[PDB]
Design a protein around this ligand. Structure first.
Ligand SMILES: COc1cc(Nc2c(C#N)cnc3cc(OCCCN4CCN(C)CC4)c(OC)cc23)c(Cl)cc1Cl
Length: 284
């Protein structure tokens, strides 16, 4: 399983993410290229070792532009490490919140197309992500968005947005919440939420509604309102991702096709969905 990298080829330089059992670092790989490096500290359990190397094992099965590339693993020395390509701009949700208003609509839609292409690949590889959200999309210096955060039980266990099953409620499809049915179609629901995150520059879905309030609203038929300056076709597409009936949602194949057609005829994105303002400002 995958390239075993000698520790002398890897230099950890700066902590960029942290947990109780290891950290994520920016570093360099001299087989000299930048890499992300995730560690697992000594004392780890069997389950931790299986979850940790399982993330790398899963990533090693994939070869797609919109899926994080695995460079290799350090497993025969401690601490163990996973080494991936480095995504200079980090997580998409923080990136958009820090860059509010700085992109064109075409750029934002292009990000969505990349995410959708990665998700179509995963779904057709029989991989259900379960935690698709802008926080799990990473962005590089070419503005390419790539799906990250792979594994089995570790995905939802490690995410603080996932609460008690243990689930990140406001990104998750109704059937996954209600009866634990996680499929590529529940990932499509999540993708609809990601579309809303991108078009709003990282607004938190459903604002301050509690988890129960969100579930009640969804079950009563309410959906997130249109973002400001959102192409009508983009809002229509996200709304179809939120059909209660799983079978009525687009597949990722449909999503990629639609986004590709909109990008290739970019004037189609100048028609905007009506934005319902929450504030009335009236001047004589
Ligand atoms: C290596 O192993 C793994 C690494 C990761 N995670 C990452 C991968 C991957 N993959 C790639 N690239 C990453 C880049 C990151 O931050 C870049 C610095 C952004 N700046 C931060 C400061 N602000 C103000 C400006 C932007 C990053 O940050 C936490 C995590 C990354 C995952 Cl999810 C799983 C495994 Cl197994």
């Amino acid at each position: 399983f995958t390239t075993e990298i000698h520790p002398s080829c890897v230099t950890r330089q700066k902590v960029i993410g942290a947990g109780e059992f290891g950290e994520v670092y920016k570093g360099m790989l001299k087989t000299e290229v930048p890499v992300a490096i995730k560690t697992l500290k000594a004392g780890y359990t069997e389950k931790q070792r299986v979850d940790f190397l399982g993330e790398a094992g899963i990533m090693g099965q994939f070869s797609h532009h919109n899926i994080i590339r695995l460079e290799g693993v350090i497993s025969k020395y401690k601490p163990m490490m996973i080494i991936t390509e480095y995504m200079e701009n980090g997580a998409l949700d923080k990136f958009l919140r820090e860059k509010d208003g700085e992109f064109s609509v075409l750029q934002l839609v292009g990000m969505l197309r990349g995410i959708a292409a990665g998700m179509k690949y995963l779904a057709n590889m029989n991989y259900v992500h379960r935690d698709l959200a802008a926080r799990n999309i990473l962005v590089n210096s070419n503005l390419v968005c790539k799906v990250s955060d792979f594994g089995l039980s570790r995905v939802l266990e490690d995410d603080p947005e996932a609460t008690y099953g243990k689930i990140p409620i406001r990104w998750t499809a109704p059937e996954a919440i209600s009866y634990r049915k996680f499929t590529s179609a529940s990932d499509v629901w999540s993708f609809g939420i990601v579309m809303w995150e991108v078009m709003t520059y990282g607004e938190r879905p459903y604002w301050e509604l509690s988890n129960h309030e969100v579930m009640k609203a969804i079950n009563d038929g309410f959906r997130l309102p249109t973002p400001m300056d959102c192409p009508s076709a983009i809002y229509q597409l996200m709304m179809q991702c939120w059909q209660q009936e799983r079978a009525r949602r687009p597949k990722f194949a449909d999503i990629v096709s639609i986004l590709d057609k909109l990008i290739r005829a970019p004037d189609s994105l100048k028609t905007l969905a009506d934005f319902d303002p929450r504030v009335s400002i009236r001047l004589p």
